Amino acid sequence: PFTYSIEATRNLATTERCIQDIRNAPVRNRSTQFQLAQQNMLAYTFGEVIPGFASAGINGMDYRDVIGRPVENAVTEGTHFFRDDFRVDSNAKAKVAGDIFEIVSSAVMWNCAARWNSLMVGEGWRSQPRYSRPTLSPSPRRQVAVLNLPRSFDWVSLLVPESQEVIEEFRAGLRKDGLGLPTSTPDLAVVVLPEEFQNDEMWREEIAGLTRPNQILLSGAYQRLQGRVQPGEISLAVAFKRSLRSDRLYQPLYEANVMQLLLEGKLGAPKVEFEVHTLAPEGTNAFVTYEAASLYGLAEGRSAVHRAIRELYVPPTAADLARRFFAFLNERMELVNG
Amino acid sequence: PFTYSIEATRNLATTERCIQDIRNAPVRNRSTQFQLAQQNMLAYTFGEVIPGFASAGINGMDYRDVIGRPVENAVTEGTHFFRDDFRVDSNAKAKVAGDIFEIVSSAVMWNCAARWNSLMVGEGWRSQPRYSRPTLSPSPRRQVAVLNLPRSFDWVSLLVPESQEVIEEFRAGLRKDGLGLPTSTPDLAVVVLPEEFQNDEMWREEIAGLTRPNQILLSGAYQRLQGRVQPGEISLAVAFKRSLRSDRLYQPLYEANVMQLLLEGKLGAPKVEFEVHTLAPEGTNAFVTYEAASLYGLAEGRSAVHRAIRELYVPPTAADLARRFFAFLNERMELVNG
DNA sequence: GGTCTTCACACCGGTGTGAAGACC
DNA sequence: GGTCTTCACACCGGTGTGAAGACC
Ligand SMILES: [Ca+2]
Ligand SMILES: [Ca+2]
Ligand SMILES: [Ca+2]
Ligand SMILES: [Ca+2]
Ligand SMILES: [Ca+2]
Ligand SMILES: [Ca+2]
C-alpha cells in the first residue's frame, strides 16, 4: 500500500515483489544485482490510491513526496528481504522516479478527463473531492481523451488517413534525398474524443488505483484512437521532466518544434499547444529559456511569430494539477461547436 | 606526469594537487567531500605530453585509454593522501572526463593548425611525427585558427560589426514580441585567420604540453579574433560528447539548427559545417538519426535541402584525429583564393 | 511458429568553474 | 572598489521495458 504494510509485503508473490534479484541472471553488458520492478512498485504503492482523488492528506501532500514513495518503499522491501547485500544504483532510482512521475500525472489527468466527460454527457458533477464546477455549457461533443504514448511511438498514426497522406509524402520526399525527420515521442496528448466514441462508457468512469489491469488500460488507450483524430483536434501536448538541467531542457524544445512543423505547416492547424511539467527547476533559467520563439517560418516572415512551448508549470500538489487541467479544459472546450 | 610518478606527486604544492579536500569548506547545497581539480589534473597528466604529437605508443594508444588517465591518476593520488576516507562520485568523474576529452581534442587540433600554418607561411613541414604532407599549393592566406569557446559564449561577437548589426536587429525584432533565440555554445570553431594576424608567429608554434600557461593561451584565443571574422570564413564547427544517448544526441542538433538559421538565412553563407565527435556511440542509432535534414526553409521550399550535421566521427587514436583534420584542411582550403 | 533473448528508447541527479554579485 | 561568495552552464553513465529478433 501507500505506507508499506509488512503483512501486505509478506502476502505478495515472488514475481510481484518491488525488487527482482538478478544476481544469477545477469544482463548482457551490465553489472546490476537487484533491479527495481517499476510496474510492481506502481501496483504496490498506488494500487488503491490515485493522488488528487483520494484523501485530502494525500491530495494536499507535497507532490515531491508523493513521487518518491514507491522508491523508498522498494528500498525498505529490499532491506527486509536482503540484508547487508542489498544495494541499488542512484541512476536506476532516477530513471524509475521519472517514469513514476510521468505515469502518475497521466493517471491524475485521466481521472480529471473522466469527470469532465461525465459532466459533459449530463450525468452530474462528482463531489467527493471538492473541485469547482466548470461553467461551460454541457455538450456531448466537448469530450476529451487523455493518451499516454509509448516510448517509440510515431504519433502521426493517430491522424486520419487523408491528413497522414501528405505527411507521408513529405517524409518520402525527404527520404529520396537521403534525409530524415527524427524526433522523440511526446509524453502525453490530450485530444478531442472522436465521434464514434461519444457514447462509450469507458471514457466516463474513474479508476480506483494503478493496478496492473488499470496500467494496461491507460497504456493501451492510444490504440483505440489510432487513425481517428483530426489534425485540428489535438488540444494539448505535455512533456514531463522530474528535474531540469541547462542542457536537458533543449530536448522538449526540438520536440515542440518538429510537431509544429508537421501541424501548422503541412496541415494548416491553428496553433499547437505544448507545455512542460517539472518538480525542480532550480539551478537553471528555464523560465526565460522557454520564452523562445518556434523555429518555423522565421526564415520567410510569412506568418505570425509565437513560442514553441506554452508554459512551464511546477505543481505543488496533485490537487493543483487537477484544478489546472479543469481550468484549461473549461477555457479551451468553448472553441468546440456543440 | 602521464604515468603517475610518486616523487612528482610529493614535489607538488598543496594548491596544485589533483584532488582538493573541501570537507571543512562545504559547497552551499552540496555534500561533496573531495573535488577533482580539473585544471590541476590536466597540468599533471598532460603537462609535457600532447596526444598525436608525442611518442608513438601515446600516439597509437586506444584513445579511450588516453582520455581517462587523468581520472585514475587523481584516484591514485587521493588514495595516497587519504586512506579509507577518500571517495569520489561517479557523476563528477563523468563531468571531468567530458571536459578533459573536449580540451585534449582542442589542443590536438590546435597543434595540427599550427603545423598547417607553418607550412602555409613556407617554413617547411615538420616531420618528427610522420604525417602525409598536404598537396595544396602553399599560400599565406590559407591559414586557419582553432578557437575553443567558453561555456556561456554567444559566438556572434566574433563576427564583423556590419554582419553583427543585422543579427542584432533580428534579435531585437524578436525581443520586442517578448520572444527569444537561446542556444548552447558550440564547443570548437575552426575559422580562417584574419588579414591583420597573417604574420603573427603565435599561430605557427606548437605547445609542448597542457600547462596552465598553455591552458590559458588556448582558452583565451577567442578574444583575439573577436569582432574580426567574416560570416563566410567559419570553416568548421565541432561538438564533443564522450558518450552518446538516445536523448542527449538531440542537444547538438538544435545547436546545428540555430547556427545555420543565423548564417544561411540572415547572412547568405554558402553552408555551415557542423560535426559531432564521440568515443562510444553504442546503445543508440545515431548514425541514422544524424542523417537528418536541417530545420530551415522546409516550410517554404525556397532552397535546397541538406543535413544539419556533417558527420559523426569516432576517433580510435589521436593520430587518426590529426590525419582527419589535416585531410579536411587540405580539401577545404582550396576554396580560399590565395 | 512459438518462446527465449537481446537491443534501442528515454530516464535523470551529482558535478568544476568562470563570472555576476554583494557587503565591507 | 577590491576581494570573497554564490549561481547558472553543460557535463555524462547506470538504467526498466516494450519490441524486434533468432534458432529451435
Ligand atoms: Ca516518456
Ligand atoms: Ca509516455
Ligand atoms: Ca518524460
Ligand atoms: Ca563545452
Ligand atoms: Ca568549449
Ligand atoms: Ca562537449
XYZ file of C-alpha atoms (C1' of nucleotides) and ligand atoms in Angstrom:
730
model
C 0.000 0.000 0.000
C 0.923 3.676 0.345
C 2.525 3.197 3.786
C 4.366 -0.147 3.373
C 2.401 -2.711 5.364
C 4.638 -5.609 6.399
C 1.807 -8.145 6.108
C 0.991 -6.928 2.595
C 4.627 -7.417 1.577
C 4.640 -10.917 3.080
C 1.445 -11.847 1.211
C 2.951 -10.787 -2.131
C 4.048 -13.395 -4.643
C 7.699 -13.725 -5.638
C 7.071 -12.292 -9.124
C 5.027 -9.378 -7.710
C 7.759 -8.001 -5.432
C 9.071 -4.477 -5.942
C 12.682 -5.693 -6.327
C 13.835 -8.557 -8.547
C 17.055 -10.400 -7.720
C 19.027 -10.983 -10.926
C 22.354 -11.981 -9.385
C 22.016 -15.393 -11.071
C 20.571 -13.900 -14.294
C 22.909 -11.056 -15.293
C 22.152 -8.581 -18.065
C 24.400 -8.785 -21.127
C 26.697 -5.791 -20.553
C 25.511 -4.704 -17.093
C 26.591 -5.478 -13.528
C 23.161 -4.891 -11.965
C 22.436 -7.143 -8.978
C 18.944 -6.027 -7.892
C 16.503 -4.348 -10.267
C 13.552 -2.104 -9.433
C 10.321 -3.651 -10.743
C 8.724 -0.389 -11.865
C 5.253 -1.765 -12.626
C 5.235 -3.865 -9.450
C 6.227 -0.764 -7.473
C 3.393 1.227 -9.055
C 0.908 -1.547 -8.258
C 2.133 -1.797 -4.655
C 2.248 1.917 -3.824
C -0.674 3.229 -5.915
C -2.798 0.099 -6.343
C -5.728 1.674 -4.491
C -4.698 5.356 -4.248
C -4.716 7.974 -7.006
C -3.288 11.371 -5.970
C -5.710 14.258 -6.291
C -8.705 11.931 -5.878
C -8.043 10.135 -2.579
C -7.913 11.554 0.931
C -7.011 15.216 1.448
C -3.803 14.317 3.261
C -2.711 12.577 0.071
C -4.309 15.281 -2.074
C -2.575 18.124 -0.221
C 0.763 16.426 0.442
C 3.872 17.929 -1.134
C 3.770 16.368 -4.585
C 7.537 15.813 -4.440
C 6.921 13.460 -1.505
C 4.160 11.629 -3.394
C 6.559 10.990 -6.286
C 9.218 9.131 -4.328
C 7.152 6.968 -2.005
C 7.470 3.919 -4.340
C 11.274 4.175 -4.379
C 11.619 4.272 -0.591
C 9.016 1.520 -0.197
C 11.084 -0.597 -2.593
C 14.282 0.190 -0.672
C 12.595 -0.879 2.571
C 11.396 -4.117 0.957
C 14.877 -4.855 -0.382
C 16.385 -4.242 3.045
C 13.835 -6.657 4.518
C 14.388 -9.468 2.013
C 18.157 -8.966 1.636
C 20.481 -7.750 4.371
C 23.996 -6.297 4.009
C 23.814 -7.456 0.379
C 21.155 -5.079 -0.950
C 22.179 -2.010 -2.942
C 20.604 -0.022 -5.784
C 22.375 2.469 -8.039
C 21.178 6.072 -7.937
C 20.794 6.167 -11.731
C 18.187 3.394 -11.622
C 16.373 5.336 -8.903
C 16.362 8.458 -11.088
C 15.042 6.565 -14.125
C 12.290 4.868 -12.123
C 11.357 8.147 -10.416
C 10.956 9.912 -13.756
C 8.798 7.107 -15.130
C 6.667 7.091 -11.960
C 6.187 10.862 -12.174
C 5.037 10.574 -15.790
C 2.631 7.690 -15.156
C 1.105 9.200 -12.003
C 0.496 12.569 -13.669
C -1.054 10.768 -16.644
C -3.403 8.835 -14.342
C -4.429 12.003 -12.487
C -5.283 13.752 -15.741
C -7.108 10.618 -16.940
C -9.399 10.799 -13.904
C -9.871 14.532 -14.486
C -10.873 13.806 -18.092
C -13.259 11.074 -16.935
C -15.002 13.522 -14.600
C -15.140 16.122 -17.384
C -16.696 13.627 -19.808
C -19.237 12.530 -17.196
C -20.236 16.171 -16.725
C -20.450 16.699 -20.494
C -22.782 13.718 -21.004
C -25.082 15.089 -18.298
C -24.573 12.531 -15.518
C -23.800 15.251 -12.964
C -20.724 16.552 -11.162
C -18.928 14.234 -8.750
C -18.299 15.905 -5.411
C -16.492 13.519 -3.027
C -13.328 15.582 -3.577
C -14.471 19.198 -3.883
C -13.491 20.961 -7.108
C -15.027 23.987 -8.789
C -17.755 23.012 -11.231
C -16.994 24.151 -14.803
C -19.236 26.944 -16.071
C -19.167 25.788 -19.705
C -22.484 24.758 -21.214
C -22.599 20.934 -21.233
C -22.475 19.218 -24.618
C -21.612 15.616 -25.567
C -19.203 16.713 -28.319
C -16.971 18.651 -25.891
C -15.364 15.458 -24.580
C -11.624 14.861 -24.314
C -9.336 11.833 -24.333
C -6.014 11.632 -22.479
C -3.463 9.373 -24.185
C -0.158 8.357 -22.617
C 2.044 7.492 -25.539
C 4.647 4.693 -25.645
C 8.393 5.301 -25.765
C 8.940 4.813 -29.516
C 5.568 5.917 -30.913
C 5.482 7.955 -34.118
C 2.340 9.902 -33.044
C 1.306 10.540 -36.663
C -0.579 7.233 -36.959
C -3.274 8.824 -34.775
C -4.193 11.148 -37.655
C -6.877 10.482 -40.260
C -5.519 8.824 -43.442
C -6.176 11.893 -45.609
C -4.044 14.024 -43.278
C -1.497 11.199 -42.994
C -1.009 11.000 -46.771
C 0.507 14.484 -47.093
C 2.790 13.860 -44.102
C 3.951 10.575 -45.632
C 4.517 12.279 -48.994
C 6.644 14.984 -47.351
C 8.594 12.332 -45.429
C 9.182 10.322 -48.616
C 10.311 13.458 -50.435
C 12.932 13.994 -47.747
C 13.804 10.276 -47.773
C 14.513 10.318 -51.518
C 17.237 12.909 -50.825
C 18.759 10.648 -48.158
C 17.478 12.866 -45.334
C 15.127 12.231 -42.427
C 12.922 13.848 -39.791
C 13.559 12.079 -36.474
C 12.132 13.168 -33.140
C 11.377 11.856 -29.667
C 7.844 10.866 -28.733
C 5.987 13.436 -26.602
C 4.820 12.099 -23.261
C 1.089 12.860 -23.115
C -1.520 14.029 -25.633
C -4.955 15.452 -24.806
C -7.238 15.315 -27.854
C -10.924 15.684 -28.687
C -12.903 12.452 -28.429
C -13.875 11.066 -31.870
C -17.491 10.960 -32.996
C -17.932 7.176 -32.895
C -16.679 7.030 -29.280
C -19.010 9.781 -28.000
C -21.256 7.243 -26.218
C -18.883 4.534 -24.952
C -18.838 4.480 -21.156
C -15.177 3.598 -20.575
C -14.217 7.258 -21.137
C -16.548 8.284 -18.288
C -15.536 6.019 -15.375
C -12.699 6.713 -12.947
C -10.102 4.165 -11.848
C -9.664 3.315 -8.175
C -5.908 2.743 -8.355
C -2.899 1.942 -10.503
C -3.346 -1.805 -10.665
C -1.789 -3.788 -13.495
C -5.155 -4.060 -15.340
C -5.559 -0.291 -14.985
C -1.937 0.209 -16.053
C -2.648 -1.772 -19.226
C -5.917 0.114 -19.767
C -4.204 3.508 -19.529
C -1.203 2.343 -21.585
C -3.277 0.982 -24.475
C -5.772 3.822 -24.837
C -3.789 5.241 -27.772
C -4.502 2.219 -29.990
C -8.253 2.857 -29.760
C -7.942 6.370 -31.235
C -5.336 5.392 -33.843
C -6.198 6.728 -37.285
C -9.264 8.573 -35.992
C -8.090 12.059 -34.901
C -8.335 15.224 -36.985
C -5.208 17.425 -37.104
C -7.117 20.301 -35.501
C -8.468 18.206 -32.614
C -5.118 17.871 -30.804
C -5.721 20.168 -27.838
C -2.692 19.696 -25.574
C 0.764 18.124 -25.569
C 2.577 17.634 -22.260
C 6.186 16.621 -21.598
C 7.166 15.550 -18.074
C 10.622 16.020 -16.538
C 11.078 15.413 -12.814
C 14.059 17.792 -12.745
C 15.536 20.316 -15.162
C 19.095 20.960 -16.305
C 20.521 23.653 -18.562
C 21.333 21.068 -21.259
C 18.412 18.641 -20.930
C 15.698 21.302 -21.299
C 16.533 21.591 -25.011
C 15.171 18.087 -25.685
C 11.457 19.061 -25.430
C 12.071 22.249 -27.439
C 13.183 20.282 -30.500
C 10.092 18.126 -29.988
C 7.840 21.179 -29.763
C 9.475 22.392 -32.964
C 9.069 19.258 -35.081
C 5.450 18.702 -34.043
C 4.591 22.269 -35.039
C 6.487 21.797 -38.307
C 4.078 18.982 -39.158
C 0.883 20.661 -37.895
C 0.995 24.402 -38.607
C 2.973 23.902 -41.821
C 1.633 20.862 -43.666
C -1.917 20.725 -42.252
C -2.940 24.325 -41.521
C -3.706 23.795 -37.840
C -4.341 26.997 -35.829
C -1.548 26.540 -33.275
C -0.054 23.644 -31.323
C -0.200 23.661 -27.525
C 2.866 22.152 -25.859
C 3.885 22.516 -22.211
C 6.472 21.054 -19.844
C 5.805 19.908 -16.278
C 8.610 19.770 -13.721
C 9.116 19.448 -9.975
C 12.545 21.109 -9.582
C 13.602 23.918 -11.955
C 16.249 25.311 -9.585
C 19.811 25.754 -10.791
C 18.679 26.789 -14.290
C 16.999 29.733 -16.027
C 14.271 27.778 -17.806
C 11.535 30.355 -17.147
C 13.408 32.651 -19.556
C 14.750 29.979 -21.923
C 11.192 28.790 -22.627
C 10.193 32.311 -23.620
C 11.609 31.357 -27.018
C 10.078 31.608 -30.485
C 9.325 28.483 -32.520
C 11.823 27.680 -35.251
C 9.299 27.750 -38.053
C 8.665 30.421 -40.647
C 11.395 32.667 -39.188
C 13.436 32.439 -42.387
C 10.448 33.524 -44.504
C 8.464 36.034 -42.432
C 5.204 34.779 -43.983
C 3.332 34.329 -40.699
C 2.989 35.442 -37.096
C 5.743 34.529 -34.666
C 4.936 32.658 -31.483
C 6.604 30.463 -28.867
C 7.440 26.772 -29.245
C 6.349 25.995 -25.665
C 3.128 27.170 -23.990
C 4.304 27.345 -20.361
C 6.470 25.755 -17.673
C 4.400 24.507 -14.732
C 5.552 23.293 -11.312
C 2.680 21.544 -9.493
C 2.996 21.837 -5.705
C 0.265 19.215 -5.150
C -1.818 16.847 -7.262
C -4.987 18.800 -6.452
C -3.393 21.859 -8.059
C -2.649 19.813 -11.186
C -6.275 18.648 -11.260
C -7.517 22.231 -10.886
C -5.192 23.452 -13.643
C -6.368 20.732 -16.030
C -10.014 21.502 -15.220
C -9.481 25.221 -15.856
C -7.661 24.513 -19.127
C -10.488 22.257 -20.310
C -13.095 24.853 -19.318
C -11.251 27.616 -21.180
C -10.439 25.629 -24.330
C -13.507 23.446 -24.977
C -15.569 26.593 -25.634
C -13.999 26.780 -29.108
C -15.628 23.431 -29.995
C -19.035 23.953 -31.610
C -21.590 21.765 -29.843
C 53.281 13.026 -15.470
C 51.496 10.562 -17.755
C 52.377 7.540 -15.583
C 51.926 8.926 -12.031
C 55.412 9.348 -10.590
C 55.315 9.230 -6.788
C 58.170 11.735 -6.450
C 56.398 14.165 -8.784
C 53.264 13.952 -6.635
C 55.313 14.544 -3.480
C 57.000 17.600 -5.023
C 53.632 19.169 -5.891
C 52.314 22.093 -3.883
C 49.125 21.775 -1.845
C 47.152 24.009 -4.237
C 48.464 22.122 -7.302
C 47.199 18.678 -6.262
C 44.697 16.829 -8.436
C 42.187 16.495 -5.562
C 41.078 19.301 -3.246
C 39.759 18.468 0.220
C 36.688 20.603 0.940
C 35.391 18.741 3.988
C 35.895 21.923 6.042
C 34.663 24.204 3.216
C 31.354 22.729 2.022
C 29.514 23.915 -1.074
C 26.184 25.649 -0.460
C 23.729 22.873 -1.382
C 26.174 20.008 -1.993
C 27.620 17.220 0.152
C 30.870 16.883 -1.815
C 33.869 15.929 0.333
C 36.714 15.721 -2.211
C 36.642 17.585 -5.518
C 38.547 16.812 -8.714
C 40.787 19.754 -9.645
C 40.227 19.533 -13.399
C 42.896 22.040 -14.454
C 45.414 20.614 -11.979
C 44.688 17.133 -13.348
C 45.244 18.351 -16.912
C 48.528 20.000 -15.909
C 49.704 16.864 -14.084
C 48.785 14.280 -16.723
C 49.361 16.273 -19.938
C 51.813 18.943 -18.773
C 54.503 17.702 -21.164
C 52.580 15.278 -23.422
C 50.141 16.122 -26.215
C 48.459 13.081 -27.819
C 49.096 12.707 -31.528
C 52.394 14.607 -31.262
C 54.362 12.695 -28.614
C 55.728 9.163 -28.739
C 54.059 6.578 -30.981
C 52.970 4.493 -28.007
C 50.974 7.510 -26.862
C 50.038 8.379 -30.445
C 48.774 4.870 -31.228
C 47.223 4.051 -27.854
C 43.479 3.446 -27.712
C 42.175 6.994 -27.445
C 39.612 5.852 -24.866
C 42.535 4.952 -22.589
C 44.198 8.333 -23.185
C 41.000 10.101 -22.101
C 40.740 8.580 -18.639
C 44.346 8.571 -17.483
C 43.867 11.851 -15.517
C 40.892 10.428 -13.603
C 42.712 7.276 -12.495
C 45.851 9.273 -11.681
C 43.697 11.517 -9.486
C 42.085 8.492 -7.817
C 45.539 7.069 -7.068
C 46.670 10.406 -5.613
C 43.559 10.626 -3.438
C 44.122 7.090 -2.179
C 47.707 8.047 -1.317
C 46.872 11.257 0.547
C 43.650 9.988 2.159
C 43.001 6.408 3.216
C 39.646 4.731 3.942
C 38.161 8.242 3.802
C 38.593 9.003 0.097
C 35.640 8.653 -2.268
C 34.547 10.427 -5.457
C 31.086 10.319 -7.019
C 30.788 8.820 -10.494
C 28.926 11.893 -11.779
C 31.917 14.126 -11.025
C 34.122 11.626 -12.854
C 31.823 11.762 -15.890
C 31.782 15.575 -15.933
C 35.564 15.820 -15.611
C 36.075 13.131 -18.265
C 33.898 15.001 -20.753
C 35.735 18.262 -20.111
C 39.113 16.515 -20.459
C 38.040 14.930 -23.750
C 36.988 18.325 -25.113
C 40.160 20.130 -24.023
C 42.541 17.410 -25.237
C 40.895 17.217 -28.665
C 41.031 21.017 -28.893
C 44.758 21.005 -28.081
C 45.461 18.288 -30.662
C 43.678 20.257 -33.368
C 45.476 23.430 -32.234
C 48.832 21.745 -32.862
C 47.561 20.466 -36.215
C 46.557 24.024 -37.149
C 49.951 25.333 -36.028
C 51.712 22.855 -38.317
C 49.356 23.771 -41.169
C 50.045 27.491 -40.711
C 53.799 26.877 -40.583
C 53.544 25.000 -43.882
C 51.418 27.773 -45.405
C 53.929 30.503 -44.496
C 56.693 28.474 -46.150
C 58.753 27.411 -43.125
C 58.647 23.746 -44.164
C 56.883 20.595 -42.997
C 57.686 19.251 -39.538
C 58.492 15.553 -39.626
C 59.293 14.263 -36.115
C 55.885 12.545 -36.116
C 55.313 11.342 -39.679
C 52.161 12.644 -41.364
C 51.324 12.962 -45.044
C 52.356 16.329 -46.441
C 49.391 18.297 -47.847
C 49.398 18.653 -51.630
C 47.722 22.078 -51.634
C 49.736 24.944 -53.072
C 51.147 26.945 -50.132
C 49.763 30.442 -49.599
C 49.840 32.723 -46.531
C 46.108 33.493 -46.769
C 45.106 29.819 -46.412
C 45.741 29.853 -42.658
C 43.281 28.647 -40.029
C 42.604 29.409 -36.372
C 41.207 26.896 -33.873
C 39.123 28.501 -31.117
C 37.864 26.634 -28.060
C 34.876 28.609 -26.914
C 33.834 29.214 -23.286
C 30.734 27.696 -21.703
C 28.400 30.707 -21.995
C 29.774 32.418 -25.114
C 27.340 33.935 -27.606
C 29.626 33.190 -30.612
C 28.162 36.074 -32.640
C 30.570 38.645 -31.168
C 33.263 37.054 -33.354
C 31.537 38.458 -36.450
C 32.336 41.782 -38.108
C 30.117 44.659 -36.880
C 28.332 45.030 -40.228
C 27.283 41.369 -40.103
C 26.509 41.698 -36.383
C 24.104 44.604 -36.944
C 21.568 42.557 -38.922
C 21.736 39.725 -36.372
C 21.153 42.198 -33.538
C 18.257 43.782 -35.445
C 16.628 40.371 -35.954
C 17.158 39.530 -32.275
C 15.637 42.857 -31.200
C 12.679 42.302 -33.514
C 12.018 39.000 -31.767
C 12.644 40.610 -28.361
C 10.006 43.291 -28.979
C 7.437 40.480 -29.314
C 8.568 39.002 -25.985
C 10.335 36.094 -27.708
C 13.949 34.946 -27.759
C 16.516 32.814 -29.573
C 18.504 30.881 -26.956
C 21.060 28.198 -27.736
C 24.023 26.394 -26.216
C 27.551 27.390 -27.166
C 29.241 25.051 -29.668
C 32.451 23.506 -28.393
C 35.077 24.301 -31.037
C 35.228 26.596 -34.074
C 37.780 26.415 -36.897
C 37.846 29.678 -38.863
C 40.028 31.428 -41.431
C 42.789 33.559 -39.926
C 42.084 37.311 -40.279
C 44.215 39.508 -42.512
C 45.924 41.509 -39.753
C 47.047 38.301 -37.992
C 48.559 36.704 -41.123
C 52.128 37.373 -39.914
C 51.993 36.931 -36.125
C 54.097 33.953 -35.063
C 51.972 32.671 -32.171
C 49.659 30.917 -34.662
C 52.646 28.963 -36.026
C 54.299 27.471 -32.914
C 53.277 24.219 -31.239
C 52.823 23.748 -27.496
C 54.839 21.136 -25.619
C 52.110 20.263 -23.119
C 48.925 21.315 -21.369
C 50.478 23.505 -18.713
C 48.418 26.201 -17.024
C 50.018 28.964 -19.174
C 49.206 26.906 -22.273
C 45.708 26.233 -20.923
C 45.164 29.987 -20.592
C 46.665 30.589 -24.044
C 44.325 28.079 -25.696
C 41.324 29.246 -23.641
C 41.747 32.937 -24.486
C 42.434 32.644 -28.210
C 38.809 33.543 -28.987
C 39.162 37.076 -27.589
C 41.891 37.873 -30.125
C 39.609 37.138 -33.103
C 36.532 38.784 -31.561
C 34.794 41.113 -33.996
C 37.181 40.223 -36.821
C 35.690 37.181 -38.623
C 33.607 37.296 -41.797
C 30.419 35.181 -41.813
C 31.748 33.120 -44.723
C 35.107 32.382 -43.072
C 33.712 29.963 -40.463
C 35.019 26.668 -41.830
C 34.167 24.073 -39.173
C 32.116 23.667 -36.004
C 32.768 20.680 -33.738
C 30.774 19.420 -30.751
C 32.375 16.850 -28.438
C 30.467 14.199 -26.474
C 32.413 11.417 -24.767
C 29.377 9.115 -24.955
C 26.036 9.220 -26.749
C 22.493 8.555 -25.567
C 19.221 8.465 -27.480
C 18.006 11.623 -25.699
C 21.236 13.615 -25.336
C 22.145 13.494 -29.043
C 19.344 15.980 -29.775
C 21.216 18.768 -27.955
C 23.815 19.361 -30.730
C 21.119 19.108 -33.423
C 19.260 22.133 -32.055
C 22.625 23.902 -31.952
C 23.383 22.954 -35.554
C 19.941 24.288 -36.433
C 20.159 27.691 -34.749
C 23.656 28.416 -36.061
C 22.504 27.683 -39.609
C 19.417 29.836 -39.034
C 21.739 32.777 -38.388
C 24.263 32.038 -41.163
C 22.476 30.657 -44.231
C 19.368 32.754 -43.574
C 20.408 36.221 -42.414
C 23.917 36.411 -43.920
C 23.839 34.358 -47.132
C 26.656 31.996 -46.180
C 27.139 29.004 -48.527
C 26.620 26.255 -45.937
C 27.595 25.672 -42.312
C 29.818 22.724 -41.412
C 28.966 21.114 -38.075
C 30.107 17.702 -36.837
C 29.990 15.683 -33.621
C 32.883 13.691 -32.157
C 32.245 10.772 -29.811
C 34.067 7.810 -28.294
C 31.125 5.464 -27.583
C 28.025 5.534 -29.824
C 26.868 2.038 -28.820
C 23.360 1.523 -27.495
C 21.898 4.145 -29.859
C 21.166 4.598 -33.569
C 22.910 7.944 -34.021
C 24.439 7.064 -37.405
C 20.884 7.141 -38.796
C 19.484 9.898 -36.564
C 22.185 12.295 -37.800
C 21.155 11.632 -41.389
C 18.526 14.301 -40.738
C 17.656 17.436 -42.699
C 18.178 20.891 -41.193
C 15.054 22.580 -39.882
C 15.365 25.628 -42.082
C 13.463 26.532 -45.217
C 11.438 23.291 -45.076
C 8.196 25.216 -44.595
C 8.886 27.370 -47.673
C 10.661 25.150 -50.214
C 12.687 28.143 -51.454
C 16.087 26.439 -51.285
C 17.967 23.154 -51.409
C 17.568 20.748 -48.515
C 20.605 19.474 -46.659
C 21.575 17.952 -43.315
C 22.021 19.837 -40.042
C 25.111 17.794 -39.102
C 28.061 16.997 -41.388
C 29.140 13.641 -39.918
C 29.563 11.581 -36.752
C 33.199 10.621 -36.156
C 34.663 8.145 -33.661
C 38.451 8.602 -33.413
C 40.224 5.360 -32.474
C 43.505 7.208 -31.792
C 44.720 10.800 -31.645
C 46.878 10.270 -34.740
C 43.714 9.425 -36.678
C 42.123 12.669 -35.471
C 45.217 14.581 -36.601
C 45.113 12.895 -40.016
C 41.397 13.636 -40.399
C 41.899 17.309 -39.541
C 44.828 17.547 -41.972
C 42.774 15.969 -44.767
C 39.825 18.272 -44.050
C 42.081 21.334 -44.164
C 43.692 20.139 -47.405
C 40.301 19.557 -49.036
C 38.625 22.767 -47.843
C 41.335 25.454 -48.010
C 41.423 25.086 -51.810
C 38.238 27.181 -51.992
C 40.137 30.150 -50.498
C 41.619 32.341 -53.236
C 45.292 32.951 -52.478
C 5.754 -20.534 -35.156
C 6.030 -20.301 -30.624
C 9.117 -18.825 -26.783
C 13.509 -17.183 -25.185
C 16.833 -13.314 -25.820
C 18.931 -9.236 -26.985
C 18.794 -4.105 -28.082
C 17.354 0.817 -28.630
C 14.490 4.420 -26.296
C 14.449 7.936 -22.713
C 15.087 8.448 -17.913
C 17.681 11.894 -14.554
C 20.989 13.603 -10.284
C 25.780 14.778 -8.569
C 29.053 17.943 -10.512
C 34.053 22.069 -11.656
C 34.435 26.551 -12.933
C 34.001 31.192 -14.920
C 31.506 35.212 -13.910
C 27.985 38.024 -11.764
C 27.253 39.563 -7.103
C 27.283 41.724 -2.548
C 28.799 43.935 1.571
C 32.547 45.855 3.513
C 36.493 49.160 -5.307
C 38.732 45.376 -4.150
C 38.036 40.526 -2.580
C 35.049 36.905 -1.001
C 30.842 34.280 -2.354
C 27.190 32.392 -4.696
C 24.890 30.691 -9.098
C 23.953 29.118 -13.919
C 26.155 26.442 -17.742
C 26.958 21.845 -19.593
C 28.978 17.583 -18.382
C 27.697 12.282 -18.765
C 26.994 6.901 -17.142
C 23.932 3.286 -14.940
C 19.280 2.067 -16.111
C 13.438 -0.872 -16.864
C 10.874 -2.281 -20.512
C 8.474 -2.928 -24.928
C 9.514 -4.902 -29.221
C 12.381 -6.798 -32.838
C 14.997 -10.996 -33.237
C 16.762 -15.694 -33.728
C 17.148 -20.591 -33.541
C 14.740 -24.399 -32.450
Ca 8.021 9.048 -21.991
Ca 4.564 8.308 -22.440
Ca 9.328 12.320 -19.625
Ca 31.813 22.947 -23.870
Ca 34.423 24.879 -25.337
Ca 31.009 18.964 -25.096
